[PDB]
Amino acid sequence: SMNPPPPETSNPNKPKRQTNQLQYLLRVVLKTLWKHQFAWPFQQPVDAVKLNLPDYYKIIKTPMDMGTIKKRLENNYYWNAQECIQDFNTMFTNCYIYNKPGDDIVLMAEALEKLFLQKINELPTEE
Amino acid sequence: SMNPPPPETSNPNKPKRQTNQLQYLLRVVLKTLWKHQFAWPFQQPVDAVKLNLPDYYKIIKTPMDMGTIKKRLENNYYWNAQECIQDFNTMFTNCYIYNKPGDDIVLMAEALEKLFLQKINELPTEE
């Protein structure tokens, strides 16, 4: 069927804060992953209509992409840094779920995940 | 307006040889790229009538696709491995010529080209 609406990126009913960790997630982590050569299939929601992949949103019921993560950080959607880390992890595991071990797109996602973990290793200490 | 005939894949007046490099180009290179998740647009000649690309064959005068390269290797059309490498390069550059920087199909071709170059980096030594 159609693509779903993209994930929500603003929450008017949630309090907001800036923290060293959230700032780092946007300015360093999201900036480094976006520019990686393997990033583009993960930068926006999968457009299953344009690709003619009717089963994508039958299989992936928790979609996530780097464009959504960028918007959530910019809109202070996340109170805890772990909420953002979970969204990255959802994006990577969605690739592993939809595809098969050893697929090329999976290898791309695995390399992005290794870079993400290397950058998370340098997250500033919690307040 | 119409599609041309596909590229020739047999040459009865050319001598034939089976080499380490040609074997690898079919069994490893052609096979790996064929199975990549981004391979579908490159597996057969561009059907410009069905894709509604009437200017495709006015711009691309040296068409090439993976299916033609596969048949070329199976039929011993190539004497030198470089002849096959040239056909892959023609496939990738045709995509860049017809389309524009940053187009989804160009990013697909670029990923296939980088993987192709990695596999060529491991071509067996020339006899």
Side-chain angles (χ1 to χ4, degrees), chain A residues 3-9 45-46 57 61-65 68 72:
Chain A
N3 295 328
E8 188 52 73
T9 53
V46 168
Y57 291 106
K61 297 304 197 187
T62 313
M64 180 66 43
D65 65 280
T68 292
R72 284 180 171 197

Side-chain angles (χ1 to χ4, degrees), chain A residues 66-85:
Chain A
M66 292 186 74
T68 292
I69 295 167
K70 182 176 175 283
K71 285 174 200 186
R72 284 180 171 197
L73 289 159
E74 277 157 6
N75 297 338
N76 316 293
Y77 190 83
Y78 302 121
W79 184 262
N80 291 322
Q82 180 63 35
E83 299 177 63
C84 175
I85 291 165

Side-chain angles (χ1 to χ4, degrees), chain B residues 6-26 28-65:
Chain B
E8 189 58 71
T9 52
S10 295
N11 196 339
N13 299 125
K14 204 182 162 153
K16 298 191 187 315
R17 78 174 168 176
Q18 291 181 334
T19 72
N20 54 344
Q21 294 196 324
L22 290 168
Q23 179 210 285
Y24 176 94
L25 280 163
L26 183 57
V28 171
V29 184
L30 190 279
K31 202 178 163 180
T32 289
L33 280 49
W34 192 271
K35 289 159 64 183
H36 196 288
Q37 284 68 48
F38 302 166
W40 86 89
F42 306 100
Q43 281 171 349
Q44 293 177 335
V46 169
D47 188 344
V49 312
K50 167 202 210 141
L51 287 170
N52 180 38
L53 301 181
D55 55 350
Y56 188 85
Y57 291 108
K58 297 188 202 24
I59 293 159
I60 300 304
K61 295 307 195 182
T62 313
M64 191 45 58
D65 62 280

Side-chain angles (χ1 to χ4, degrees), chain B residues 3-26 28-113 115-117 119-126:
Chain B
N3 297 326
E8 189 58 71
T9 52
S10 295
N11 196 339
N13 299 125
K14 204 182 162 153
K16 298 191 187 315
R17 78 174 168 176
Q18 291 181 334
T19 72
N20 54 344
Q21 294 196 324
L22 290 168
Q23 179 210 285
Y24 176 94
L25 280 163
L26 183 57
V28 171
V29 184
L30 190 279
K31 202 178 163 180
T32 289
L33 280 49
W34 192 271
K35 289 159 64 183
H36 196 288
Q37 284 68 48
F38 302 166
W40 86 89
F42 306 100
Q43 281 171 349
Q44 293 177 335
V46 169
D47 188 344
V49 312
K50 167 202 210 141
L51 287 170
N52 180 38
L53 301 181
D55 55 350
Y56 188 85
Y57 291 108
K58 297 188 202 24
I59 293 159
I60 300 304
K61 295 307 195 182
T62 313
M64 191 45 58
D65 62 280
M66 292 224 270
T68 295
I69 294 171
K70 183 179 181 284
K71 287 178 202 186
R72 294 221 161 161
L73 291 160
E74 292 158 341
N75 300 343
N76 314 118
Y77 189 88
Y78 302 122
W79 182 266
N80 291 324
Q82 191 56 216
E83 295 173 82
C84 175
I85 293 168
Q86 188 197 287
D87 277 351
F88 277 104
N89 295 329
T90 291
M91 178 186 79
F92 298 129
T93 55
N94 285 347
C95 185
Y96 312 152
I97 288 164
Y98 183 72
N99 306 100
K100 298 299 187 289
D103 290 351
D104 266 17
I105 188 73
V106 168
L107 297 176
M108 307 166 71
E110 284 174 6
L112 294 168
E113 178 181 24
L115 183 57
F116 168 77
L117 290 169
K119 299 304 181 176
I120 299 301
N121 191 46
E122 293 323 289
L123 193 67
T125 54
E126 178 175 359

